[PDB]
Every structure is written in structure tokens, then in C-alpha cells.
């Protein structure tokens, strides 16, 4: 907090917002939906829309970055970062991760003439994420790179899409109405076993304040000796255990779904930054359980002649927390057949339509969407990328 | 030290010990089948054959019985592929069913009702009945191992073994696997996999990560990194491809002395090895298994935890030919799921559907198609392919008895 910012906080550079415009966008009551000006066209006529959260942070902590890299060949790059505990990490990542990608790819650019080649691309991305973190880790001592962020990027390289995800953002393809998932989320519920095992193997990271076991609820001192249900790292099911003091510490993973936390602190298990993140008023470091390694899924743009409405949707959890893949698919396939297939603004409007269907409208009782469901109060950022440019 | 149990063949073969001797012939390789006089539960079929020479004993073991759980019926099939001795596989084939029975007794009352009970805002968590059975099996493997760990000092429980079991409990099948054996259901020609193998290839990242976290487990003779081939000293300083625990792809590294140690995982595929010793990563026993002439213990990298997959026998009215195949790697090392699927659906339509010996004949047919015939060019199967020289054990379980 004593250090200067590495970059000024801003919105994605491609929005071309002046800083009077940036202020007007930060409204928690009107929640203006920013879209991509028609004067500024993104690669592949990519559509983008975003909206600031309903009040839980003064800044929109999402960041987005979109440009065409050049490897000494062309490499298109889209990226989304969901910031938490500050905007520093996401801002930094949205400007620098592409250069770690470009440089890791330069190591193998020649070999990409003719171990499959795809596995070399995947390895470069995994190296780039590791190298983007670490740089945050070392420059942390010279700049205020606050907090951390999830990181979802995609590159088009020689006719294939690589979707690298480390966090809770999500990518799906809508190809002729059908949903092809391009990522899976990294939350305490989905990555329990890794965390529990690392706690079992290195129990000092639990700081005599947590247990690596998971129970159906909170265990009380009242209940010592009774047969309670437990789940260990090597288990997917549940069996009965007698409660033994150590079982009275706070569970390392507690909470059913979207409400589920690692050491009662963080609801996502992968991403960048958070290097000095510590437990709730404690001195236990969270980062030993966090990982900067992404999962990479490949889509080969050649196996199929895509249509005007065949799109890759990228969005932060702000979208997916209120909308299923099927609703998102419904909204796209309902909307895009109503815009002229030659309109370059066509996909930005689809991005806007999705954000609107997740943000909702403002009632006396809060933000509400369709069927009196509660709307998302998070930041929402949406990319609609038309696959037809990959044919 | 004495044996915990005598070496033998599966009890349901009713073999005398003269019959067991003639069965251990590495040249004739006789295919043993289930005598028609002895029916297994559900008229399950069984066949087996000894290896082509790599051990004097058939080191596979099998066990099949109907358990009774009391504070209900629980059908039980099991396969064990032993290595480095017969002791571990024998013990498990006699005792693991008792560990399953005992873990199930704790929850048997809960299981014949609705809702599971954690004892005996402010959110709780509901745990389905299936999740308690899964927890029992996982505990059972842990307890079967461990008992081997401690009784090891009083009896000669040699070696280790992989373990694939399946139980039928209240209309659901639970297939628990810890090793490289395999289970598939062949339902109306379609292949439903019910297991996945646990080998150095399939569990690379877990092993590398554990080696990274506790490098004392490598004793300065191995590196936790993987390379596309063996790293030579001549390549110190050069840019080579490597793969670490957090990677699915490959990137470039400078070779840095430590990268000259022996790879923790080496070998192309199924022929991949952990610390140059064992080609499977899960199962029982192996407690004093050490590295090739070393004092480094392997067991820290092995796991007795099984993967458990559930098949609901209620969702569909099975046919005479809808079967669950259990078999040791000896079958799958030369036969794909599709060949086995082809062979079952080709064979069974030729036996009367009420024939109780019908599925044993299919089991025998599968073993035959994997063992082959021996001329001069080796053991050869169809299309001049090289036959399996491992022990082979096959179960054909008719799913129709589960309707
Ligand atoms: Mg955020
Ligand atoms: Mg968020
Ligand atoms: Mg064997
Ligand atoms: Mg074998």
C-alpha cells in the first residue's frame, strides 16, 4: 500500500474510454453497460460488453485485453481477468500476460513448420501463466499489485483455438445451437482432493488452526466421541469417524456450492497474485494452496465450416452465477438471427444482450432478472467471438 | 515366517492339488473353467490361464461369494493381480470381503430407508445413500491394506497386488478398482467403461507432485521431472523438452545437473515405470517394496484408494447378452474393449439363453482369444498378433439377474 501503482487503474484499453467516461461508468445504481464503440472494431469483429458490480467494490475489478500478437506468425489473443481483493493483479495481467505468451511461443515458433505440436503450444501457455505470476511475485516489492485474479485467455494459433483457464470464469462454444464447453471451473468444491492432500502432506500450512477433513456441517465440542460423517483426501464418499480433538478445528473446506471457501478466505483455487494473502486476521498464508497452472482445452477450427451465429462465449462468473449454459445458448440463438449477417456490430450487441439478461433491472428489493430471479451483483464481462473467421 | 494362507487357485474351481499342478504348465497353458457342477452366483462365468513362463505360479487370484450384512444380501466378485509373490493376492482374496462386510454393517440400517444422518445460514449437507456405500468400500481397501501392513510381521505375506472388486447392493453395482485391471459393461453391443487404470502414465502428476513436495522420497537418485527420452550428461547446458507436475504439455528447460538423475516416470505407455520398478500405482501390499538394489521404499508413491463407479441396475431391462466383464490386464494387454465387445456379441447368440454354462463358455472364449496357440513363432492370436503371456482371469457377469 506504500508503493506506486504499476499501471493506472482503467477499463480495457480497447473501449477507448476517456477518464470522464470511466468515472460515469462506475455507477452502482444505474450500472451503465459499457459496449465496444462501432468506431473501434476488435479483431474478428469480436463483441464485448461489461457492467460494474452493484456496490461490493468501488472499482470494476474485471479486466479484459484483446489484440493480435506477432511471434518472431499471427496469434490472436483474448483474455478475461476477474479481480478480487484489489484491481492491481488484474490490471497488470491484462497488460503483461500476452508478452509472456509471445515469448514462450517464440521458443517453439520455428518447430511449428511441419510429441505432437499441440502439446508444445499447451506447454508454452502453462509456462506463460507460471511466468506471469512470479513476475507479479517479484515486482510485488516495487509496485502495489493488490490482490489476485482469475485468468481466462484464448489464442487462435494456426487454425486452432487454445482456451487456458485458471479460475472460475467460463468459456463455451455455441455451434449450431449445441453447447461445447471449453473450460471447467477451479473452486474449493471441484478441487477438494488436491487441497486436502497437500494439507495432509505438509500439515504446517494448516497452522494448528484447521483440519484437512471435511464434515457435513461444523463439528462442536459437545460432540466428541460420536460417530460423525467425514471425508478425507483419498475418499469421494463418506464414512463414520469418532471425533478426536483435532477434528474440532475449522474445516479446510467449508460450504456447499458457490458459497464454499478454502480456510474461510477464498472461493477460487487457481489464478495469479495473492502472494501475501493471509487467513482472516491470522498469519497463515493462502498462496501455498493456490495454483497458477491453467487447464487447456483445444478446439480445431478446421473440422467444421462455421456459420454467422457460431460463436465462442467468454464471460466472468458474474454472468454464469445467474445464467446456465442453456439460457446463454437460448439468448444467443434467439438474438443473433435478428441482426444482419454483414453487420460488424452484430456480436457486440449479442454481448450486450447477454450482460443485460444477467444484470437485470433495478427494483425496490434489488436487481431482478426474468422469472423474479435475483440478478447478478458482480462485475460482468462478456466476449462473443464469431468462429466464422476461423474457416 | 509361515504363510497366512496356502497358495491355491480360486476356491470355486474346486481344484484338487494334483489338478492345480497340471494347471501350472507354461507350455500347454491349459485354460481352466468353472465346472458345470459348481454354479457361481447369477450363473457368472469364469476362466483363467497361467502365464507363459514369467513365474512358476499363477499370481492372479479371484473370489466370488454372496455376503450377508447384519447389525441384507451383498453379491461380491473380486480379481487380484499379484506381483513379486503370491502372498498379498491370496490374503486379499480371502479377507477383503470381510472388511467390506464390516464397514457395511455400520450403515446397513440407514441403507434400507430414506435420508442419511450425520451423527450415529447454519447450512448442513445431505449425503446420498450411494455416497455411504462408496465410503465403505474406500474404507475397506484402506483396512485390508494396513491389516497386511501389521500382520506382515507374523506371516509371509509376499509382494503386493492390484484389486478390482464389484458388489451388488440394493439394486446398484459398485465397481471399485485399485490397479490396472479393467471392468466394462457390454449392453446391447455398446461399451460402458466401469473402471480406469492406475498406472505411472495415468497418475503421473500425482506422483511428480508428491516427489516435489517430499524430495526425500527420491533419496538423491531420481528426479521428479519427465523427459521424452533418457537425459545424457553430454546435454548439460542444452535446451531440452521437460514436463513438470503442473503441466500437460512440454516446454524447454536448460539441463541442470539434477536433470541427470533417473526419471521418476520413464517408459512410453502401459510400459511406463515408477522409479524403474513397478508399472502400476495402486493396490495392496508392497509395504517393504524397495527400488532395484536400493533402500528407497516405493510404497510412499503407491495408494490403496480405489476409484468407485456406480451402475444403477434399475434404469433398463437387460437382455440375455448384457454383461459386465471383469478381467486382469492379461486380457486387455492384447485385446481392446471393441474386440471383447465384438467377441461377446458374436459368441453368446450361439448358446441357448437358458444355458447356465453359457457365460463360462464366453469367459473361456475370451481367454482363448487372448492366449492364442503356440507354434514356433510364439503364442499367437488372430491376425498373427502376439498373444498375451501374462496370467489371464475373466469374469462374465450377466446383468439380467439384476433386473
Ligand atoms: Mg470481481
Ligand atoms: Mg467475480
Ligand atoms: Mg502378475
Ligand atoms: Mg498381470
Author numbering:
A (entry chain B): 33 to 104, 142 to 183, 235 to 511
B (entry chain A): 35 to 105, 142 to 190, 229 to 511
Task: Give verbatim excerpts from the published study on this entry.
Recent work has shown that the metal‐dependent protein phosphatase PPM1H counteracts LRRK2 by dephosphorylating Rabs. The crystal structure of PPM1H reveals a structurally conserved phosphatase fold that strikingly has evolved a 110‐residue flap domain adjacent to the active site. Cellular assays, crosslinking and 3‐D modelling suggest that the flap domain encodes the docking motif for phosphorylated Rabs. Therefore, PPM1H has acquired a Rab‐specific interaction domain within a conserved phosphatase fold.
Full‐length PPM1H expressed in E. coli cells was unstable and prone to degradation, thus difficult to crystallize. To design a crystallisable protein, the N‐terminal residues 1‐32 were eliminated due to predicted flexibility. We also introduced a D288A mutation (PPM1HDA) that destabilizes a third metal ion (Mg2+/Mn2+) at the active site. Previous studies of PPM1A (D146A) showed that this variant acts as a substrate‐trapping mutant (Debnath et al, 2018). Crystals were grown of PPM1HDA that diffracted to 3.1 Å resolution, but no crystals grew of the WT enzyme. The variants PPM1HDA, PPM1HWT‐LD, and PPM1HDA‐LD have identical 3‐D structures with two Mg2+ ions at the active site. However, all of the structures are identical with only minor differences arising from flexible loops and the presence or absence of the third metal ion at the active site. The asymmetric unit in all 4 structures is a dimer that is facilitated by interactions between α3 of the flap domains, as well as contacts between the flap domain (residues 356–360) and α2 of the catalytic domain.
